Every structure is written in structure tokens, then in C-alpha cells.
């Protein structure tokens, strides 16, 4: 379970590699509902095919 | 049966007016007619005054 290479052993395209923890422990307090809801819910506005779905709605369909 | 608003508001275009075209080109033919319109009223008032 060791990794012989240094940080790069660790993937960063991972799920839940933006919450791996290396040597910012401070940031496990931060964790609380507010700030994760904010970063969901700024994945979520910058979601591609809604996106592309609202355009399509509001510019070809609605005119 | 529309595909979407702007297709409808071509069919809405071409159904008042002969010519196709935007809200834009509705409202430009309806105003030059209502001008003509307008002028045939008071070619009708200057034969009334005219004939006066």
C-alpha cells in the first residue's frame, strides 16, 4: 500500500481525489455542510449537458 | 405543429403579411400601410373639403 514514486503515485482525475488530504489538515474543519453544498453545487452549474440543454431550450426552442 | 418560437413567429409574419420575415419586418409593413391608411383618410377628407 506504499507508493515507492512521491505524490505523483496518487490519481488526479480520482473521484475524490480533491479531498485527499497530503499536508492540509486544517481544511478537515472546513468540511461542514455550507462550503461542500457550494462546491457541489458549483460542479453542478458547470455541468455540460444541462448546459447545453438550457441553450437549447431557451435560444433554439423559446426563440 | 411549430417546430419553435422563431418558426412561429415566421408563420405569424407570413400569415399577416405576404412577406416573410421577423417581428421587426411585422411591424415595418403594418406601419407603412397604417401610413398609406392614413393618407387615404384624409385624401377622403380633402374630397369632403374639396367638394365644400
Known amino acids: 500500500m506504499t507508493m515507492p514514486n512521491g505524490s505523483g503515485g496518487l490519481d488526479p482525475g480520482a473521484w475524490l481525489s480533491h479531498w485527499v488530504n497530503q499536508a492540509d489538515l486544517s481544511s478537515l474543519a472546513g468540511r461542514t455542510e455550507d462550503e461542500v453544498r457550494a462546491y457541489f453545487e458549483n460542479l453542478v452549474q458547470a455541468d455540460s449537458g444541462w448546459g447545453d440543454a438550457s441553450n437549447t431550450f431557451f435560444n433554439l426552442i423559446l426563440g | ?46 374630397l369632403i373639403d374639396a367638394i365644400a
Open chain 2, 1 to 46: 405543429g411549430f417546430q419553435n418560437l422563431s418558426e412561429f413567429v415566421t408563420l405569424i409574419v407570413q400569415a399577416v403579411t405576404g412577406a416573410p420575415g421577423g417581428l421587426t419586418d411585422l411591424q415595418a409593413f403594418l406601419t407603412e400601410r397604417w401610413g398609406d391608411l392614413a393618407d387615404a383618410f384624409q385624401a377622403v377628407a380633402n
